[PDB]
Scaffold this active site. Structure first.
Site, PDB file in Angstrom:
ATOM      1  CB  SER A 158      87.453  42.846  34.010  1.00 50.46           C
ATOM      2  OG  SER A 158      86.258  43.454  34.545  1.00 50.46           O
TER       3      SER A 158
ATOM      4  CB  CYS B  73      86.113  45.486  37.830  1.00 52.60           C
ATOM      5  SG  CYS B  73      87.471  45.656  36.599  1.00 52.60           S
TER       6      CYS B  73
END
Ligand SMILES: Cc1ccc2c(c1)[C@@H]1[C@H](CO2)CN2C(=O)CCN12
Length: 284
Positions: free
Chosen positions: A222, A215
């Site tokens: 994530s 991310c």
């Protein structure tokens, strides 16, 4: 304790902030000395988010082997993930070097390039077939093969070429495009659909290197992705799916990267995703 009942008990009591702070207090603290070396300052997006030395991914080069990326190895579930930050202008070549060296089949992206009016990661893949990208620092070429745009996610087929050997590989790019700029999604339905699309591709399977997940910082969205996937896999393997403890799985994953799940709202969303996940694949 059945997590669905634990869930209603925390919601009725409004104790999400209290549960979350208990996790923060019990989480592992391991050294990150390589991340903090002066030579690596422009390889880190955020001063407070660093990979631990024991679990960091090493680049295969003698110059400088450092990238902000961690190997999450889940022994009972038999799954591995690499969690990394969104690439920076000076780390896009390192990023693709890592995908090449680790033999990954899939990249999972959970952010937009711009959010809240600010840049959250580099434009690190090509947007048109006829305009390929060359990374001169790592000797790689990247070409867009095809693009499938859906309402909640886009899937891309990419060709990565090692210019040194002329070997090529097909990489799949799974781009979740609708996480809101503030907070978490109201329903986990579209996130769950996305997760089971990544699985169906083979990208999470043991015949390939670990999936690369990112991310902006590579800990919050994530963290939510790998925590939901591992908890659902453990519910399929165990005699008693009710023995899966999401707080204990999250603390195991935090042995390998700091800060996974950034807010009490991300912790509640992760519970919601696993619970609904169970119903769909275990009830009906
Ligand atoms: C729990 C859950 C929700 C959604 C979802 C799946 C699982 C996935 C794929 C469909 O999306 C296809 N699939 C099945 O038919 C069985 C489960 N698995």
């Amino acid at each position: 304790m059945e997590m669905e009942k634990e869930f209603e008990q925390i919601d009725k009591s409004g104790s999400w902030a209290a549960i979350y702070q208990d996790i923060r207090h019990e989480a592992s603290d391991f050294p990150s000395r390589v991340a903090k070396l002066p030579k690596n300052k422009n390889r880190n997006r955020y001063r407070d988010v660093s990979p631990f030395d024991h679990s960091r991914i090493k680049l295969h080069q003698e110059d400088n082997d450092y990238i902000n990326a961690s190997l999450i190895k889940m022994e009972e579930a038999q799954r591995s993930y690499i969690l990394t930050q969104g690439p920076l202008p000076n780390t896009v070549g390192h990023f693709w070097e890592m995908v090449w060296e680790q033999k990954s089949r899939g990249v999972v992206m959970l952010n937009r390039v711009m959010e809240k009016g600010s840049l959250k990661c580099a434009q690190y893949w090509p947007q048109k077939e006829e305009k390929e990208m060359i990374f001169e620092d790592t000797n790689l070429k990247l070409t867009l093969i095809s693009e499938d745009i859906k309402s909640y996610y886009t899937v891309r087929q990419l060709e990565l070429e090692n210019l040194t050997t002329q070997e090529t590989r097909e990489i799949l790019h799974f781009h979740y495009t609708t996480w809101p700029d503030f907070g978490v999604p109201e329903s986990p339905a579209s996130f769950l659909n996305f997760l089971f699309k990544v699985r169906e591709s083979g990208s999470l399977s043991p015949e390939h290197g670990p999936v690369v997940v990112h991310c902006s910082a590579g800990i919050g969205r994530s963290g939510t992705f790998c925590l939901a996937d591992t908890c659902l896999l453990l519910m399929d393997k165990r005699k008693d799916p009710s023995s899966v403890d999401i707080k204990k799985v999250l603390l195991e994953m935090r042995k390998f990267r700091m800060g996974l799940i950034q807010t009490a709202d991300q912790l509640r969303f992760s519970y919601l995703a696993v619970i609904e996940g169970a119903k769909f694949i275990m009830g009906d």
